[PDB]
């Protein structure tokens with residue numbers, strides 16, 4: 375059960391922290407890129423400045439709510455070093471570990487926050503899980519950030535024209551065969567009324583099956599991305615990319631959202647955006663789909 379006008383409180387809360395220093399907004403410039411080989415759309419943010427247990431007792435100036443739901447499980451914090459204004463942490467009240475799986479509560483809580491903020495705005499929710507996921511913090515936390523105003527992540531196109539399903543013997547999760555990386559995507563019911571705790575648990579664990587098999591033949595690492603339109607699970611072999619790019623990558627980069635700290639890199643992606651693909655390959659596993 376989400377707090378009322380939770381947007382306003384996040385907005386009300388951020389405008390302050392920015393003013394008094396309790397958080398600091400890195401400047402960035404961002405541009406869209408399209409993959410000529412794969413058709414995938416890339417949103418590339420440039421922040422050269424970045425080239426230059428806090429969730430236990432975070433500055434209260436940073437704490438939107440002490441308990442998100444009626445339950446005493448979650449606070450809501452503001453990322454103290456935002457690139458996208460207002461990026462929020464969903465944080466466990468009593469410490470849990472980031473290696474820990476997501477629970478029916480976690481997903482619905484987060485989904486309900488999606489529904490609060492989304493009352494052309496769009497929001498992304500992700501979880502970096504494991505040494506290789508892009509995680510910098512062990513206190514379990516989920517992330518919520520605005521996605522880009524005009525941007526079409528490939529999950530969308532793979533997900534449109536396809537009504538919600540839980541995999542049927544004649545059906546797997548949805549997986550784009552064009553791209554380099556293994557990933558798993560399921561469509562969600564459009565009106566949030568068709569969406570509840572048990573449905574996501576199904577979705578998540580299901581996805582989690584296919585995901586898990588990428589170890590049993592490195593400690594399990596992966597990304598979860600969740601939007602009102604779909605849920606997606608990515609298995610992760612590395613945190614940072616290979617030799618061309620040496621990019622650090624978290625859940626966002628698997629809807630195509632990339633954060634680079636130096637200009638040459640920005641240029642090289644611009645010259646050849648498909649390198650992004652190879653990077654998600656380097657941090658991922660090779661793709662499967664088109665098969666069973």
Ligand SMILES: Nc1ncnc2c1ncn2[C@@H]1O[C@H](COP(=O)(O)O)[C@@H](O)[C@H]1O
Nearest residue numbers: 424453455456457458626627631632633
């Ligand atoms: N794809 C992304 N787009 C925008 N901000 C991001 C992205 N990935 C991470 N961040 C945030 O940007 C800040 C810098 O992260 P880092 O790039 O690891 O130095 C942190 O607040 C991150 O959570």
Ligand SMILES: Nc1ncnc2c1ncn2[C@@H]1O[C@H](COP(=O)(O)O)[C@@H](O)[C@H]1O
Nearest residue numbers: 428432452453454455502508509510511
């Ligand atoms: N003291 C802090 N208070 C709130 N957020 C923080 C603090 N230190 C780091 N972060 C953010 O915590 C997030 C960690 O995400 P990740 O590195 O994917 O685990 C990033 O958005 C960081 O900017």
